[PDB]
Design a protein around this ligand. Structure first.
Ligand SMILES: Cn1cnc(-c2nc(C(=O)O)c(O)c(=O)[nH]2)c1
Ligand SMILES: [Mn+2]
Ligand SMILES: [Mn+2]
Length: 180
């Protein structure tokens, strides 16, 4: 499993996963499912930011916690936007709002209401992707164009197929159900 992760994602993502893992106190060699999930969340987040005009998105995910909070504060103190209570993943300079990306292995609408009640924000936008090509967003506003969202969708599934081609998909979808 660990070997798969390291040859499936790019070193830059892999390294960023390992960092966040050790911060929480988690061993990337023992909890290899959480390893793969973080790598995935990262990738999805980067492809999502890619998706706008050059200066559009601010990437909050992947940074160091302290530095990430400093970024948020800078936005709130400049746009007027209400400060969130938990760390989002992006900010949209076009739609004047924060974004939270999720990647789940259970239902889009199940994961949505777990994240929304956790943030309790009438301003932070939400967007959930699935390993089955499904998506849900606050007020059904999906931010990006069809082509962009479809690419991430495609990719997520390619990983889903890839794990299953080694018999790691069952264990991976079970582990998220084992977490909640
Ligand atoms: C219960 N749980 C397990 N993993 C997460 C989780 N944590 C984070 C995080 O920022 O720590 C995410 O961005 C994310 O998408 N999921 C939450
Ligand atoms: Mn996050
Ligand atoms: Mn997220």
């Amino acid at each position: 499993m660990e070997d798969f992760v390291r040859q499936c994602f790019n070193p830059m993502i892999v390294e960023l996963a390992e960092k966040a893992m050790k911060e929480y106190g988690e061993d990337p060699k023992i909890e290899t499912n959480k390893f793969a999930a973080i790598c995935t969340h990262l990738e999805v987040c980067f492809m999502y930011s890619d998706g706008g005009s050059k200066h559009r998105f601010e990437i909050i995910e992947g940074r160091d916690r302290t530095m990430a909070w400093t970024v948020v504060n800078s936005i709130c103190n400049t746009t007027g936007v209400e400060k969130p209570k938990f760390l989002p993943d992006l900010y949209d300079y076009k739609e004047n709002r924060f974004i939270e990306i999720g990647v789940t292995r259970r239902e889009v609408h199940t994961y949505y209401l777990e994240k929304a009640n956790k943030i309790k924000s009438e301003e932070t936008h939400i967007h959930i992707f699935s390993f089955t090509g499904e998506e849900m967003a606050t007020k059904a506003d999906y931010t990006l164009d069809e082509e962009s969202r479809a690419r991430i969708k495609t990719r997520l599934f390619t990983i889903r197929q890839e794990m299953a081609s080694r018999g790691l998909w069952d264990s991976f979808r079970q582990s998220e159900r084992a977490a909640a």
